[PDB]
Every structure is written in C-alpha cells, then in structure tokens.
Ligand binder design. Structure first.
Ligand SMILES: Nc1nc2c(ncn2[C@@H]2O[C@H](COP(=O)(O)OP(=O)(O)O)[C@@H](OP(=O)(O)OP(=O)(O)O)[C@H]2O)c(=O)[nH]1
Ligand SMILES: Nc1nc2c(ncn2[C@@H]2O[C@H](COP(=O)(O)OP(=O)(O)O)[C@@H](OP(=O)(O)OP(=O)(O)O)[C@H]2O)c(=O)[nH]1
Ligand SMILES: Nc1nc2c(ncn2[C@@H]2O[C@H](COP(=O)(O)OP(=O)(O)O)[C@@H](OP(=O)(O)OP(=O)(O)O)[C@H]2O)c(=O)[nH]1
Ligand SMILES: Nc1nc2c(ncn2[C@@H]2O[C@H](COP(=O)(O)OP(=O)(O)O)[C@@H](OP(=O)(O)OP(=O)(O)O)[C@H]2O)c(=O)[nH]1
Ligand code: NA
Ligand code: NA
Ligand code: NA
Ligand code: NA
Ligand code: NA
Ligand code: NA
Ligand code: NA
Ligand code: NA
Lengths: 192, 194, 193, 194
C-alpha cells in the first residue's frame, strides 16, 4: 500500500538533520517522485471517496503534487493558497496569518473567495504536519467561505509536535500516511 | 478532444484578459488547478517527447509543478522544481541562476540542488507561461551548469507576441507550446493562426 | 442653495485634487459623511425619479450606502447594497457580477442576494462616483439577472472626462449626476456648465 | 417607537441560523429599511440629545445607515472606519487590531485622525454587539485621537455574549435598542422587560 511505500522511501532516502528535521528532498520537497505521488493521492482518495468531497485545498509549493494527484482520483479541482504576492491573486481574498515558531514571524496566506463556496465540502491536503499553523490557516480560510471541512490529509506527520493534536481536538479528521514518533539519534521511528 | 483543443476551450470560456500583456487563468492553472486537464496536458507533453530519451523534468514553483508532475508521471521520470525563495532543506550543491523581473526591475535568484541533476540527464523543461522568457533562461542555465542536455521546453500557454519564444528558438531549443496566443489586444484572446 | 450647488461648493472648499486627477472628498463623502448634505442629495435624486415608479434602490458598499439610503428614505423604498467580500449571512441565491479595474488592471466580484430583487422591481441605482463605470455596469447586470428593470442611475460625483457615463447612456440608461466634473487638471476642479 | 418597530421586524423577518447567529439581511445587513433606520437614528439621538455629541464613529458597512440617520438628527458628522485598503485613506491613520472568534484570525480597522480631534465627544454606533471586539477597536481609535466617548449605541445586542458586559465594566454607556437574551431552539427571546 501507499503507507508502506512511503515509509520505505523515508527509510531509504530520507536524511535526519539535527535529530529534528526530516529531509526528503529526493521525492517530496524538491525532487518529486510522480509515481509515488500518484499512489499517495490514490490512498487519500480512497479514505475520502464516500465523503462527498467537492474541492481540495492545499498551499504552495510542496503540497501541490500530492493534492493534485488526490484531486485527479476524486475528480475535484485543487486550490492552492499563496504565500507571497502574486500577479493575479488580487481581490476577493480570504486570508489567514501563519506564525512561525522557527523564524518568529507572522506571514499571510491567501485564497481567492471566488473559488470557495458555502456549498463546498473541502479536503485539505498538505505534505508535512508539524506545528500545524498553515493547516489552521487553511481551516480558517475554508470556514471564512462558509464551507465545511471533510478532513485533513497529511503525507508526513511529526507526531511528537502538537499540530495533529490541535486539529483533532477541534473535531477534524486527520489522515496521516506516515506518522513519525521520533527523529532522535539521527533515525526515523514510526508510531506503533 | 486533444489537450490543445481542451486548453483553448478553457481559455476562451474562463480566461479573463486584464491587459494587453496579462491573461488571467486562475480558475484552472494559476490558483485553482483542474487535475484532469493537467493530466491531458502532461500526456500531450509526454507524447511529443516520447522518443527523445527524457530522464528528468525540470520546472519552477509554483504553477509549473502540476503540469510538470503529470508529464513526469506519464514519461516515468522524476520532476525537480526550482525554488525562488530560501527553503528549509535546499541547503547544498546549489545551482543558481539570476532571473530579471520586468516589474521589479532587479534580479532575483532561483536555485536547484545539483544532487538531483546529473551530467547524464536529458532534461525536458516544463512551465505554465512563456512571456519574456527570463525564468526559462534561468532553468536552461541551471541545467547546463549541471552538465546536462536539454531535450526541449514544454509550455502550457505561450504569448507569441512577446520575445520569450523567439529567444529560446534562436538558441536552438525545441519549444512545444500547447496554446499559442497571438494577441490580447481589445480584451480578447486571439490564438496564432493554425 | 439646491443640493447640486451645495455639493459643488463643498467640493470647491474641502475637496483636494490628488495627482491632478483623483478628487479627495474624505471630509464629507468617502470617510467622514455630512449627513445633512447626504439628505439633500437623496432628496434631489428622489425628485428626479419621483414619477418613475421606483420600487427599490441598489447600490454597493461602502461610500454609496449613505446617499442611497437618503434617496430610499425620501422615495419610500428599500435599499440593497452589493457586497465586495464574504459576509456571514450572504449565502442564498447570490447574483454576481465581475468588475474590472482599468486603473489597476484587475478584476473583482460583487454580489447581491436574489432574495431581495424581484422580477417585479423597477430599480434606481445610486453610487457615489462615476468614472470608468465598471461597478455601475455590474449593478446593472445584477438587476437584469433578477429580471428587474432599471429606471436610471443616480451619481453624486461624475468625472465626465472618463468614459463611464457615455457607456451607460449609449445603452439607453438615464444617468443623473449631481456634480459633473469636466476637468481636474491644474489641481483645480472645473465643473460642466 | 423604534424599539417596538425593531422587535416586530426581528420577529417577522429575522431568521435564526444558530445559537449565535441571527439573519436580518432583509432590513439591516444587505437590504436596508430606510424608514426603520430613521426611527433608529432618532431614538439614538433622543438618548444622547443632552450629552454634547460632536461626532459619530462607526465602521463599514452595516453600521453606516443607522449611524448616518443618528448624525442627521443630532446635526453632527459621521466617520466610518474602514476594514480594507481604500483609494484615499492614506495618511494620519489611527488603527486597531480586531480578533474574530468565528475566523480565528485578526483584522485591522482604520480611521484618519484628520477627522477626529481631542475636541470631539464621540457617540459610537454599530449594528450588532456580540463579542465586542470591533467596539473595543473603535474605542481604542477614539482614545488614540484624544477624544472622549459619550457612549455606544447598538441596534441589536446579543446579551448572552460577553460584548456588552466588557464595555459596561470599562465604564461606557451602552444603549441597545434590541437586546436578545437567547437564540436557542430557533427562536428569538428578548431580555425581559418589567
Ligand atoms: N522537509 C521538512 N520540512 C518540514 C519539517 N517540519 C516542518 N517542515 C516544513 O517547514 C515549514 C514550516 O513548518 P513548521 O515547522 O510547522 O512551522 P514552524 O516554523 O512554525 O515550526 C513548512 O514548509 P512548507 O510551507 O510546506 O514549504 P514548501 O516546501 O511548500 O516551500 C513545513 O512543511 C520536516 O521535518 N522536514
Ligand atoms: N497569469 C498570467 N501570468 C503571467 C503572464 N505573463 C507572465 N506571467 C507570470 O508572471 C511571472 C513573471 O513575472 P515578471 O517578473 O514580470 O516576468 P514577465 O516579464 O515574463 O511577465 C511568472 O509567474 P510564475 O513565476 O510562474 O509564478 P507562479 O504562478 O509560479 O507563482 C509568469 O508565469 C500572463 O499573461 N498571465
Ligand atoms: N474619491 C475618489 N474616488 C474615486 C475617483 N475615481 C474613482 N474612484 C473610486 O475608486 C474606486 C475604484 O474604482 P475602479 O473600480 O478602479 O474604477 P474607477 O476608477 O473607474 O472607479 C471606487 O470606489 P468604491 O468602490 O466606491 O469604494 P468605497 O469608497 O465604496 O470603499 C470609485 O468610487 C475619484 O476621483 N475620487
Ligand atoms: N447577521 C449577524 N451578524 C453578526 C452576529 N453576530 C456578529 N455578527 C457580525 O459578524 C461580523 C464579524 O463579527 P466578529 O468580528 O467575528 O465578532 P463576533 O465574534 O462578535 O461575531 C460583524 O459584522 P460587521 O463587521 O458589522 O459586518 P458588515 O455587515 O458591516 O460587513 C458583526 O456585526 C449575528 O448574530 N448575526
Ligand atoms: Na506544506
Ligand atoms: Na513542506
Ligand atoms: Na511558471
Ligand atoms: Na506562472
Ligand atoms: Na461607489
Ligand atoms: Na467611491
Ligand atoms: Na458592524
Ligand atoms: Na454587522
């Protein structure tokens, strides 16, 4: 299954930096493995195939590939939020502020309100879930449109960081394909 | 429909002309993505380069990623997207190129890690728009810096009245543009005569 | 004075010409509002349409609201203001229109709930400024989507050297502008005589 | 009177959407009943007729209509704060942050100090009072200008939410024309009157 394939790729090609950051630039965050992305998208679609999804929401840039493969299988469009000023993202903006615990800056992410309806049932897709600030921002943007959230699909979850618990506590269904329990001693340990 | 037909229909029906030089397609390419259209676009690119020995796709965040990934999926090759800003893990073996912005009137840097580009690679560059061509030239430079060859450049929407295409063709590169726009004057899209 | 002359004097005495083509009137129209002047403006609009069988006024947030509500008060009709952004309760039967900005070369969407526009409505559109006219075209479209008819368009300040007015008039719409500005060059406001 | 007319309108046309949301788009928040707005303004003016009001402060968009009718009766100007960048609100900006529980995100509202002096005795007018964050923002803006606050006039107050108590605790006179004790079980229940 996709989970096993992903876990294998992490153990084979991932590099643990400073027992804290998991570098997977060979297939997710810089180089993209399209076949693996398709398997990931088919797994997300499988979990939400009976939820009435109308639209997927993600955020540039690493989330786009898994989100688009998921939208392809479910047959729904994919909207990616913008982090920086863009040429054609100008008005009708739904925005949220994303605080970085790392560099200690608040930044703004934005989605055009014309692409989210009160009748939309949204699946949020993202590559990493760590502290979860962008995920909260996308939840806010979806709620600002009057739309409902079917759930949140995450490729890699760092389960020792509070992002997941924050979303689940608020009632959101979180579907993480790889759940990392620890990165200490320079190696990846998966949950259970 | 083939990819070109479906893309021209989407442009006609949903594209919005904002000026002589700007065509808004945020409903299916630049903010909302139509994944099925992207697959057809990727399959079309793969067909045109099916016999050319492609080993890797190179694109640039963010709008180029979706058409690039669909092309790599069909061809069965990896996809590398250059980054425009500093990122958490793009930290070593950096290949850099200066990209002049016409609005900002200054150069910004794009980067790819050489870890993912070999001198044995035969690269297909994929991007969403071709206008003044500065990003395309930067991606060409990065591929060359890696010692790799360039099979061609695949473009979803080309503005044929701007110099980007002619500059790449004059350098000898194969440019495959699925929608070629002759003009946006009068607030309407006019495609190159076929 | 009548409303037109009161408005022109206020423009001359408190308006500021920015970049020789933008008229700043934040002291009484676009940020601070002079309610008494607004009432006189509304009464004049009402006078010009007092025998067209107006059933409803349509405007757009935010600067159009005050003159529109004063017009609706005198004519005895409700006022509907279009929205430029998401609103908590704006969800049902939304009629939308695209508004292009020649100044910024961008496009935005405005919306009105169809629940508040009937095929039996005869609508007077009220707005604060008429320049390039794209918002006015958008409100016209929304009224037509509802099957209602347009009695005319009342404008507080018209920049007559810009094409908005001629576009609307060409299409047969009555445009009633209380202050018609012929020029803003030389940092002075010249009115159409 | 205006309170009776308002309660009737709420009873006849208000739609309860939730335990926390009352839809009144038919006369206050989208379609406006100007005559009712007049009644509301005259009532606000009556309650503050002897208090030396020099200016009304409100916030776009729903607050404008009741605020302007109030200023018309009292014979004073009305200033509406803005929530978004606008063409001519460019200098002497007095700003306040406003948090939304509904949104879980913050927002900025602004007034130009050119239209507020330390000579001003301000009546704040708004359409709804719920959690009260926008009201506190307007209070902050008026205090930033060195002006005094005569009180806060509210068309519809949800008394079961903490907005009113916070302002009363800070010493402000809050005059609410309709006070809703509960929206439970899809019905509007008003605060008991003796
Ligand atoms: N590779 C990797 N990335 C991590 C890891 N932990 C967090 N990130 C990424 O760093 C960015 C910030 O995430 P957080 O770490 O939760 O935010 P924080 O700075 O407030 O803690 C995100 O990138 P992004 O916004 O998704 O960037 P982009 O890739 O889309 O440009 C996220 O995906 C990790 O262990 N490995
Ligand atoms: N929608 C639209 N975009 C155009 C058009 N022409 C150029 N662009 C986009 O603008 C960006 C380049 O901006 P400039 O620095 O002014 O370069 P330019 O002179 O070639 O336009 C590119 O975005 P990018 O780097 O691809 O950004 P992103 O979309 O990946 O974030 C390119 O795709 C057009 O007609 N319509
Ligand atoms: N003060 C002033 N404003 C002008 C002038 N010309 C245009 N505007 C205003 O600028 C805003 C945007 O106009 P555009 O849609 O770009 O097209 P326009 O310039 O032809 O109006 C409109 O405000 P709006 O949507 O009504 O904004 P709001 O005030 O309701 O927030 C319009 O009223 C001018 O000379 N002076
Ligand atoms: N219809 C309705 N609206 C409510 C109710 N409670 C609060 N609001 C409105 O929702 C908007 C946002 O409120 P918030 O900033 O989230 O504060 P809140 O937590 O008290 O709602 C405000 O509109 P605003 O800024 O005045 O919006 P606008 O209408 O001026 O655009 C406020 O008037 C309610 O029960 N019914
Ligand atoms: Na991400
Ligand atoms: Na990431
Ligand atoms: Na691009
Ligand atoms: Na682009
Ligand atoms: Na206006
Ligand atoms: Na205006
Ligand atoms: Na309000
Ligand atoms: Na409100």
């Amino acid at each position: 299954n996709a989970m096993e394939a992903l876990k294998r790729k992490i153990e084979e090609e991932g590099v643990v930096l400073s027992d804290q950051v998991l570098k997977v630039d060979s297939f997710l965050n810089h180089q993209i493995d399209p076949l693996l992305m398709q398997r990931i998208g088919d797994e997300f679609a499988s979990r939400f195939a009976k939820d009435g999804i109308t639209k997927i929401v993600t955020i540039e840039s690493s989330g786009i590939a898994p989100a688009v493969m998921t939208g392809l299988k479910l047959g729904v469009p994919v909207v990616f939020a913008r982090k920086h000023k863009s040429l054609t993202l100008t008005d009708n903006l739904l925005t949220a502020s994303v605080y970085s615990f790392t560099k200690q800056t608040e930044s703004q992410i934005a989605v055009s309100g014309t692409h989210l309806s009160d009748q939309d049932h949204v699946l949020i897709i993202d590559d990493f879930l760590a502290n979860g600030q962008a995920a909260h921002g996308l939840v806010s943007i979806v709620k600002q449109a009057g739309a409902s959230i079917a759930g949140i699909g995450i490729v890699i979850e760092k389960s020792f960081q509070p992002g997941r618990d924050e979303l689940v506590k608020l009632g959101y269904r979180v579907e993480s394909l790889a759940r990392i329990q620890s990165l200490e001693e320079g190696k990846v340990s998966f949950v259970q």
